[PDB]
Design a protein around this ligand. Structure first.
Ligand code: HEM
Ligand SMILES: *[C@@H]1O[C@H](CO)[C@@H](O[C@@H]2O[C@H](CO)[C@@H](O)[C@H](O)[C@H]2NC(C)=O)[C@H](O)[C@H]1NC(C)=O
Ligand code: BMA
Ligand code: CA
Ligand code: CA
Length: 336
């Protein structure tokens, strides 16, 4: 519908400032539209910002949190002291400056930087982007972010309170396909959670299901489990969710199709992006988001392992026929 100063067409005039913050983020924050640590840090940030939302606290007369309100930036002084928010300060400050410089709300800016960051990573779906979240927020209550040492019952209860079913919890975890850890075992800094930390694919669901065989570092870190090969890090909650009877069949269904996985993830992220808001009050500016390059590789069981190495945990469905690869066991380099 309208033409923005740069000659681009958009549906609403409210979308025109976003082409300018698109260029800034791609050039600066993402260092030339790359899919590296700034994208992975922003994905941790959008979850940690959005999940500080609790209907139960509200119901009990307490402030339950404003959801996707950018409070992790406006109140970084209190929220970055939370256990789950370590290693985010440098990214929060960079985002703060962009927000202030373009006059956009912090909650909107985090949703936008997630959609734009994912467009730099092959295989990603185009995420919906809505604008209009108010810039005013209050600090998130503590203890609303799931931890890697939490039991599955604990994660599903916290996630369920926020509004997600067990299925959507598994769908949301597709973001660990673009992930590493820095603070759980600092000895193997940026060890990847799957073999393709720069490709949004199904490898994370396949690989967390393989039998834990290797200790990748000198010792085990917090909430660390044995992984299937050198260089890969396996987190306890991911290992447990892969195997728990409440989430095992959805986890298994996510292994053979990158198309189904992307579809499910996009839908769960659209829900997470408006926690604390009425989406009918927001303006759709999804047309600003660029397409990612396609991922043409097929799902594989890496380095000589076969179906006999995966710990099938969904009792009702047989494991999908996934291709195997020859070669020895891969050793993963740190995520860039
Ligand atoms: C079931 C809840 C989840 C738990 C317990 C969990 C836990 C963690 C932990 C402990 C790390 C490592 C952080 C570090 O030491 O550097 C991590 C990394 C990451 N998580 Fe999650 N996560 C969960 C859900 C999600 C969701 C829903 C998203 C986003 C949609 C997400 C995106 C990421 C990303 C992209 C990274 C990689 C960060 C990097 O490489 O620097 N996580 N997660
Ligand atoms: C959104 O709200 C925050 C306040 O929570 C505003 O951020 C401040 O902006 C001024 C300049 O305008 C800076 O000097 C402060 O350092 C900022 N504070 C924080 C905590 O970041 C922000 O400007 C507001 N944005 C809009 C568009 O209203
Ligand atoms: C596999 O090799 C990589 C480097 O290629 C290491 O990061 C890993 O620890 C393992 O030796
Ligand atoms: Ca928040
Ligand atoms: Ca991947």
């Amino acid at each position: 519908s309208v033409t923005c100063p740069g000659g681009q067409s958009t549906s609403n005039s409210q979308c025109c400032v976003w082409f300018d913050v698109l260029d800034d983020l791609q050039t600066n924050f993402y260092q030339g539209s790359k899919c590296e640590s700034p994208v992975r840090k922003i994905l941790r940030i959008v979850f940690h910002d959005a999940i500080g939302f609790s209907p139960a606290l509200t119901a009990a007369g307490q402030f339950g949190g404003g959801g996707a309100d950018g409070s992790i930036i406006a109140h970084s002084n209190i929220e970055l002291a939370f256990p789950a928010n370590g290693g985010l300060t440098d990214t929060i400050e960079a985002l703060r400056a962009v927000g202030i410089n373009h006059g956009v709300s912090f909650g909107d800016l985090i949703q936008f930087a997630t959609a734009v960051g994912m467009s730099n990573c092959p295989g990603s779906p185009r995420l919906e982007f809505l604008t209009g979240r108010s810039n005013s927020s209050q600090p998130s209550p503590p203890s609303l972010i799931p931890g890697p040492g939490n039991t599955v019952t604990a994660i599903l209860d916290r996630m369920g309170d926020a509004g997600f079913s067990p299925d959507e919890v598994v769908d949301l975890l597709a973001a660990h396909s673009l992930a590493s850890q820095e603070g759980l075992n600092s000895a193997i800094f940026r060890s990847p959670l799957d073999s393709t930390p720069q490709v949004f694919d199904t490898q994370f669901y396949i690989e967390t299901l393989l039998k834990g065989t290797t200790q990748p570092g000198p010792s085990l870190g917090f909430a660390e489990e044995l992984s299937p090969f050198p260089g890969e890090f396996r987190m306890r909650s991911d290992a447990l969710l892969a195997r728990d009877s409440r989430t095992a069949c959805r986890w298994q269904s996510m292994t053979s199709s990158n198309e189904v996985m992307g579809q499910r993830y996009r839908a769960a992220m659209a829900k997470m992006s408006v926690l604390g808001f009425d989406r009918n009050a927001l303006t759709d500016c999804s047309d600003v988001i660029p397409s990612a390059v396609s991922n043409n590789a097929a799902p594989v069981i890496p380095g000589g392992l076969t179906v006999d190495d995966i710990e099938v945990s969904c009792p009702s469905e047989p494991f999908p026929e996934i291709a195997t690869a020859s070669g020895p066991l891969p050793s993963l380099a740190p995520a860039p």
